[PDB]
Amino acid sequence: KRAVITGLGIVSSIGNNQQEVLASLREGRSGITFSQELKDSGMRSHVWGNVKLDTTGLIDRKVVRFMSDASIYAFLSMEQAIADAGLSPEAYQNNPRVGLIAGSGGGSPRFQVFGADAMRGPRGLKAVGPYVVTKAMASGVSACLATPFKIHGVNYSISSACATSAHCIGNAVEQIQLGKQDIVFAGGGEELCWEMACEFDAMGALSTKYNDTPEKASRTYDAHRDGFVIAGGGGMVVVEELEHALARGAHIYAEIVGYGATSDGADMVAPSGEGAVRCMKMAMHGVDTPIDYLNSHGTSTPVGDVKELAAIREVFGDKSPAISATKAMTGHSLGAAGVQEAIYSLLMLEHGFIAPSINIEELDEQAAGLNIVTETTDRELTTVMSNSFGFGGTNATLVMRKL
Amino acid sequence: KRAVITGLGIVSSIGNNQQEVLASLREGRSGITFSQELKDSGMRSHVWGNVKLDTTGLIDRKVVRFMSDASIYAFLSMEQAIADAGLSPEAYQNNPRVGLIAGSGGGSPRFQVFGADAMRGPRGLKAVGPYVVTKAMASGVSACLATPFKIHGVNYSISSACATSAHCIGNAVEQIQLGKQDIVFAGGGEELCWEMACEFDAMGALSTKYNDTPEKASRTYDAHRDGFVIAGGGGMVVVEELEHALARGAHIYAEIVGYGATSDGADMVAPSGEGAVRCMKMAMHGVDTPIDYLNSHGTSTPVGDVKELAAIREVFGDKSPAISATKAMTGHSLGAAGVQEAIYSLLMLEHGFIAPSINIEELDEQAAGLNIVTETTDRELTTVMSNSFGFGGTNATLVMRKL
Numbered sequence: 152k153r154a155v156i157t158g159l160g161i162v163s164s165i166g167n168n169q170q171e172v173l174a175s176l177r178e179g180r181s182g183i184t185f186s187q188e189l190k191d192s193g194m195r196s197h198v199w200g201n202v203k204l205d206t207t208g209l210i211d212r213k214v215v216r217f218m219s220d221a222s223i224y225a226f227l228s229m230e231q232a233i234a235d236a237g238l239s240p241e242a243y244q245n246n247p248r249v250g251l252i253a254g255s256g257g258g259s260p261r262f263q264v265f266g267a268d269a270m271r272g273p274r275g276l277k278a279v280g281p282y283v284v285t286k287a288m289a290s291g292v293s294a295c296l297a298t299p300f301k302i303h304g305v306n307y308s309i310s311s312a313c314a315t316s317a318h319c320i321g322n323a324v325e326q327i328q329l330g331k332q333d334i335v336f337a338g339g340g341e342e343l344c345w346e347m348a349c350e351f352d353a354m355g356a357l358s359t360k361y362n363d364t365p366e367k368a369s370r371t372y373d374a375h376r377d378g379f380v381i382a383g384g385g386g387m388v389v390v391e392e393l394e395h396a397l398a399r400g401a402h403i404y405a406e407i408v409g410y411g412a413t414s415d416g417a418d419m420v421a422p423s424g425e426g427a428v429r430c431m432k433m434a435m436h437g438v439d440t441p442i443d444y445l446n447s448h449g450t451s452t453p454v455g456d457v458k459e460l461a462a463i464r465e466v467f468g469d470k471s472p473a474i475s476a477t478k479a480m481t482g483h484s485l486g487a488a489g490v491q492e493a494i495y496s497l498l499m500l501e502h503g504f505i506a507p508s509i510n511i512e513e514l515d516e517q518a519a520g521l522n523i524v525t526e527t528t529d530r531e532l533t534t535v536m537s538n539s540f541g542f543g544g545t546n547a548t549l550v551m552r553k554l
Numbered sequence: 555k556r557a558v559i560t561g562l563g564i565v566s567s568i569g570n571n572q573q574e575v576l577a578s579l580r581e582g583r584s585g586i587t588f589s590q591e592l593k594d595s596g597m598r599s600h601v602w603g604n605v606k607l608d609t610t611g612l613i614d615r616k617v618v619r620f621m622s623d624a625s626i627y628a629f630l631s632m633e634q635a636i637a638d639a640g641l642s643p644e645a646y647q648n649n650p651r652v653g654l655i656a657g658s659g660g661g662s663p664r665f666q667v668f669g670a671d672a673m674r675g676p677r678g679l680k681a682v683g684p685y686v687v688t689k690a691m692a693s694g695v696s697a698c699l700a701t702p703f704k705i706h707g708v709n710y711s712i713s714s715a716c717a718t719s720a721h722c723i724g725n726a727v728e729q730i731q732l733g734k735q736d737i738v739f740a741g742g743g744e745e746l747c748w749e750m751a752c753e754f755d756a757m758g759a760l761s762t763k764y765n766d767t768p769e770k771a772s773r774t775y776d777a778h779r780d781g782f783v784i785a786g787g788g789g790m791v792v793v794e795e796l797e798h799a800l801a802r803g804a805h806i807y808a809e810i811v812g813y814g815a816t817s818d819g820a821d822m823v824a825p826s827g828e829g830a831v832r833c834m835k836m837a838m839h840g841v842d843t844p845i846d847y848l849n850s851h852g853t854s855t856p857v858g859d860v861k862e863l864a865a866i867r868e869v870f871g872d873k874s875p876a877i878s879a880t881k882a883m884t885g886h887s888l889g890a891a892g893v894q895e896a897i898y899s900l901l902m903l904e905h906g907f908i909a910p911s912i913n914i915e916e917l918d919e920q921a922a923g924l925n926i927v928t929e930t931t932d933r934e935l936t937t938v939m940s941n942s943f944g945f946g947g948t949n950a951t952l953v954m955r956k957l
């Protein structure tokens with residue numbers, strides 16, 4: 152019935168493992184860079200939240216042949232989570248009570264495009280090859296992890312745009328609550344490519360006025376923010392039943408004391424706020440400790456940023472928690488945002504500190520009053536909240552508490 | 555705690571509604587046709603499981619402009635399921651206890667390729683437009699339905715390749731069991747295009763030797779089967795808590811008494827009979843009545859067909875149920891296969907008959923002591939089972955029983 156986190160893995164724009172991420176977080180270090188690929192593609196946004204690691208040879212050649220970047224990022228993340236959790240092969244493999252729930256927001260547009268492009272060339276089917284389905288299918292992230300890691304329990308992906316990996320973790324918790332699984336690896340991944348990013352630029356969702364200063368492009372809550380900075384990477388956490396964790400001597404980061412999942416039923420592409428209030432409130436049912444720190448979805452967009460702050464004002468009233476949008480540092484990894492930010496929250500809980508909300512040269516007028524921390528501040532935290540929202544009015548929030 | 559089906563909707567290769575689907579199922583009619591598009595793309599497979607329906611003015615302009623075919627098919631299926639359920643706006647909209655869990659196996663390869671092609675054109679960003687993300691994102695099917703139907707409960711997609719809509723329904727059931735939702739619209743959709751179809755052909759998964767006789771291409775269990783026939787369409791069912799349903803005088807097709815979801819942890823693109831055995835066994839746990847009819851996954855592939863059979867023989871041993879692969883008639887709608895086949899099963903339960911397993915000129919010698927029904931058989935059914943498997947070793951089976 153009770154679910155706790157006993158391990159985490161992460162490959163992000165601000166770090167290739169939790170120690171690197173930790174340092175980046177405390178230093179308010181940016182993971183955004185200039186992208187020549189995005190410029191050459193004809194986009195107006197040339198800033199990236201890229202993973203600085205050459206993944207070549209990092210996975211078994213026979214295994215990696217079926218994977219795309221989103222899967223590769225999640226795979227390396229799950230490798231870290233397994234080790235971190237102190238799980239031995241005999242403990243999680245070929246075990247019906249061990250599952251995997253991980254996904255991405257867009258699967259693999261790069262290979263969807265590669266397949267189409269190849270089909271129309273002089274080689275046709277032979278240029279396409281036999282590995283595009285597993286690379287391009289939406290469930291690639293879960294399929295490519297569950298098979299090599301020898302998982303026998305649940306195996307599927309939850310996809311909900313920019314809230315996918317958050318819903319993935321929440322679903323993992325429910326598996327533990329329903330007593331169906333003892334352990335479920337949850338998280339996700341997202342590739343970084345002009346193929347997909349150009350589609351966000353086309354709808355004006357990406358930042359375009361700070362290409363000369365990449366590290367200043369992502370500026371959540373700043374009066375002059377102008378869209379989010381697309382990013383890629385992966386994240387993975389080990390969701391485990393409490394007794395099972397305690398029995399093996401597992402190191403527990405926190406317990407998942409709240410999980411909200413609601414729907415706006417209003418606008419595609421734009422948030423309503425109303426659904427987020429219900430989502431946060433839902434995650435709070437039963438939680439009687441205060442929310443000490445709130446890791447906002449805050450993507451750095453004009454409408455989104457204040458819409459979520461309005462939701463928070465409504466849920467907490469005159470006693471809102473310390474807030475910070477780590478996306479100002481990391482960028483928006485879309486489908487991987489939820490699990491990565493849950494990890495940043497876990498690291499803050501574990502090391503007792505609040506990561507800064509960077510790049511706010513002029514706090515938005517609507518952000519007046521609120522406690523958005525703009526400096527790395529040491530503090531003993533106990534309960535933390537993390538929000539994730541996506542197109543189609545899909546909301547998710549997770550509340551984690553220290554034991 | 556108990557989940558029942560109180561409505562269904564369907565847009566498939568063998569019918570644009572449940573009445574038409576019933577007629578083809580009883581008649582043993584094939585929905586496969588020759589495809590000029592497929593042939594013209596360079597493919598070897600030129601047979602289709604297409605939806606014969608002009609969807610043109612069926613969905614509101616400002617709504618449909620965010621959708622792709624998978625979403626359009628699921629949307630029309632939802633419309634039918636709402637009416638067929640006897641539900642009205644005042645009862646299902648802006649209601650926190652009403653949710654939506656629907657997905658596709660591939661999202662929208664067509665619009666993803668369109669975006670990449672548009673971008674590379676002289677007009678770039680302006681050629682792409684602002685609607686490709688919602689059309690191409692993996693969660694499109696759920697996002698595009700939850701918003702217009704004003705859903706306020708759960709809202710996300712489950713994606714598991716050729717088992718997605720089956721896992722979607724199972725997840726909906728768990729929402730009712732966890733007491734989180736009273737109603738959850740579950741199902742999915744899949745578009746039909748060479749963009750995606752060419753990728754399956756490239757891995758030799760599609761039938762190529764019966765292009766001259768499309769209706770004979772899909773031949774599950776036949777000694778000369780040579781791959782599945784790709785198809786498109788949608789399906790949607792209303793999963794409702796028992797008491798809620800009885801209280802409103804709802805029409806109940808049956809109760810979902812079993813739901814299995816397992817993982818092979820062995821092969822990508824190839825089924826390991828053992829995972830399916832555990833999946834089926836998991837779905838039968840607690841069901842005190844025998845399985846009267848089994849709607850197999852049977853896609854008409856050399857390895858797949860008999861592997862599931864070996865799995866079935868191992869599960870039921872001596873006393874096996876009547877079996878029939880409706881894909882021999884309908885083709886493989888991939889992500890939409892699970893929900894559509896659950897609907898065929900519900901229709902057989904609701905009308906007391908077993909749909910034929912067509913096109914078996916020579917029964918595979920692997921399907922021995924089994925009961926593969928090859929003629930529409932009038933029978934009083936009580937408990938039915940439906941299997942769905944996908945790449946990455948993802949398995950799902952649903953057991954539905956009359957109340």
Ligand SMILES: *[C@H](C(N)=O)[C@H](O)C(=O)CC/C=C/C/C=C/C
Binds near residue numbers: 257260314450540666
């Ligand atoms: C991101 C957000 N609102 O924070 C939004 O939910 C979103 O667009 C996620 C979808 C990304 C998948 C890419 C599909 C493009 C082909």
Ligand SMILES: *[C@H](C(N)=O)[C@H](O)C(=O)CC/C=C/C/C=C/C
Binds near residue numbers: 287663716853888889
């Ligand atoms: C189908 C099967 N094994 O019956 C298989 O699970 C599958 O390939 C489903 C994925 C289809 C999504 C298309 C993605 C291609 C870009």
